[PDB]
């Protein structure tokens, strides 16, 4: 029964990494506020002009606005090497807002992906009233589902202070006899319901839309073929790296990888950097669906003047 001892030297450049990431996060927050705010304003203001503004766009803009608005709390906790000066209620409330809004944004991406194909094929001869009612029902259900899936993670979250480090943190405190399960459980719900199912639906229902547009002759003259694959690829690039980093973390936790201080440094750096890249997702959504479209450009130009 051999024994072994290993020390993990304190990381030298953590400060430099976190300071650079804060520099990126400030720009993310500023641009996200600007983009999402203007989209919501134009979406509300366009209904007067007579446009049939789509509800999903408005809900997506709101969800992105909330997620991006919760950044400053993260920045403050990040500058201080991930320590929680604030109280327990602040940590719970901020996490719940972040989780619910982020999940809602992803679900709305999937919803519009399906709705585009349904609109070209099936709803092409449905009265405006019926389609609007269906949209409202779907929007309410999506919000409810996001809230329901967000609750469990926040419920078990608590703030503590390290006995030795003498520093304050906020972290999840799952039931003593199920911690492992809970952890793994949440991650699956964070992946399947987060990436696998949404991405699969989006890819399939945009490929079908492209095929249908190809079968058409008048539409493809006015539409764009690449931009559809641009949506899919942008989603993949924004989200896949972060989920891959997360999956690597779980693999490390279960000891699927030998332990090395260098491994810890790379995982720490990768998780934080990919988190910043993922949050760029809320920054970029407004452009993909609103700024590209010519009608939005014209309406936004009119409003700006």
């Amino acid at each position, epitope marked *: 029964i051999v024994v072994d001892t290993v020390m993990c030297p304190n990381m030298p450049n953590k400060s430099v990494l976190l300071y650079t990431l804060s520099f990126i996060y400030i720009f993310i927050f500023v641009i996200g506020m600007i983009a999402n705010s203007v989209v919501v304003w134009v979406n509300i203001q*366009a*209904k007067t*002009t*007579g*446009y*049939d*503004t*789509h509800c999903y*766009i408005l809900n997506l803009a709101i969800a992105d606005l909330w997620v991006v608005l919760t950044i400053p709390v993260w920045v403050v906790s990040l500058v201080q090497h991930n320590q929680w000066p604030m109280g327990e209620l602040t940590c719970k409330v901020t996490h719940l807002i972040f989780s619910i809004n982020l999940f809602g944004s992803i679900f709305f991406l999937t919803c*519009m992906s399906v709705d*585009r194909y349904l*609109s*070209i*094929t*099936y709803f*092409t*001869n*449905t*009265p*405006s*009233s019926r389609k*609007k009612m269906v949209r409202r029902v779907v929007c309410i259900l999506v919000w409810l589902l996001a809230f329901c899936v967000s609750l469990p993670d926040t419920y078990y979250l608590k703030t503590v202070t390290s006995a030795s480090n003498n520093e304050t943190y906020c972290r999840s405190f799952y039931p003593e006899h199920s911690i492992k399960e809970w952890l793994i459980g949440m991650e699956l719900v964070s992946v399947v319901l987060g990436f696998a199912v949404p991405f699969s639906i989006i890819a399939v229902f945009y490929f079908l*839309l492209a095929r*249908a*547009i190809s*079968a*058409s*002759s*008048d*539409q493809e003259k*006015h*539409s*764009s073929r690449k931009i559809i694959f641009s949506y899919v690829v942008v989603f993949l690039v924004c989200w896949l790296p972060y989920h891959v980093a997360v999956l690597l973390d779980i693999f490390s936790i279960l000891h699927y990888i030998p332990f090395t201080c260098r491994l810890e440094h790379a995982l720490f750096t990768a998780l934080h950097v990919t988190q910043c890249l993922s949050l760029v997702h809320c920054c970029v959504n407004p452009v993909l*669906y*609103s700024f590209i*479209n*010519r*009608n*939005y450009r014209y*309406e936004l130009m009119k409003a700006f003047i």
Partner: antibody
Amino acid sequence: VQLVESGGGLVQPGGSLRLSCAASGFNISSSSIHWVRQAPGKGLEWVASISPSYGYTSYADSVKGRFTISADTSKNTAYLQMNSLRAEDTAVYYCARVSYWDWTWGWSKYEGMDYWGQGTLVTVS
Amino acid sequence: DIQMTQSPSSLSDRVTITCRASQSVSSAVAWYQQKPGKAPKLLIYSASSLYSGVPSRFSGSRSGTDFTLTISSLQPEDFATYYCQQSYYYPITFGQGTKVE
């Protein structure tokens, strides 16, 4: 993109009759086909509509229960089947298209009827 | 049936045709123009959006449920029976037509 109507004529009340709307251009699976009858010295009046992609029909409350509408996707046309005509059923029938455009999906307007045929005249002696 | 009341049914240039609905339709109203013995052609789809190629004289509007079409430049060709329409609720209901002379 042109629509031409073929049918019409004189048939005594109580019989059957068929109408066709032939379309040349856009494929018929990305727009909805509607029929509008204008009676002699009267105004326009909706009759029926169809989405050929899946077959979501719809009829006015006056004809609900004696008419049929079916779209031929292979030849890109529409066919309306009539049963049990009426004394006032005489009218000039137009076939119209309500369009659609995916390049305005998120921020779209309420499209109407833009392409109207010339129409066939049905008479019920 | 969401009946549409289109008035006036006659007219004598500042030309206004005001059309209202029983319920409220979210800017689904349209307008048309069929000349004697001819198929109607669209003039304003949705609330107040001209159709590509339609002259600039035609101009729409909306007041919640008191829709109205305006032509502040009356030209000789613009003589026909314009039919106010709504598409928000099935069935599609047309106005009564406002013949101009």
